[PDB]
Amino acid sequence: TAGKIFRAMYDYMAADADEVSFKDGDAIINVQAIDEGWMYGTVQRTGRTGMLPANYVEAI
């Protein structure tokens, strides 16, 4: 029942207040998903919500 969840694999560095800073090993959820472009979830490491590069995080 809605248990896809995701996971990051790199230490992305937010460029502004629109992205997030998740590191490899941290987990995240999925409030949105533009696909073929960027993503959106709440950093479980702190709770900030922003965009994420699909070329960094992946599913598990």
From Swiss-Prot:
Q: What does the UniProt record say this protein does?
A: This giant muscle protein may be involved in maintaining the structural integrity of sarcomeres and the membrane system associated with the myofibrils. Binds and stabilize F-actin.
Entry's disease: Nemaline myopathy 2: A form of nemaline myopathy. Nemaline myopathies are muscular disorders characterized by muscle weakness of varying severity and onset, and abnormal thread-like or rod-shaped structures in muscle fibers on histologic examination.
Which residues are the signal sequence here?
none
The SH3 domain is annotated at: 1-60
Listed under subunit, the entry gives: Monomer and homooligomer. Interacts with TTN/titin. Interacts with SVIL. Interacts (via nebulin repeats 160-164) with DES.
Origin organism is: Homo sapiens
Tissues with expression: Expressed in skeletal muscle (at protein level). Located in the thin filament of striated muscle.
Where is this gene product found? Cytoplasm, Myofibril, Sarcomere; Cytoplasm, Cytoskeleton
Gene name per UniProt: NEB
Q: What is this protein called?
A: Nebulin
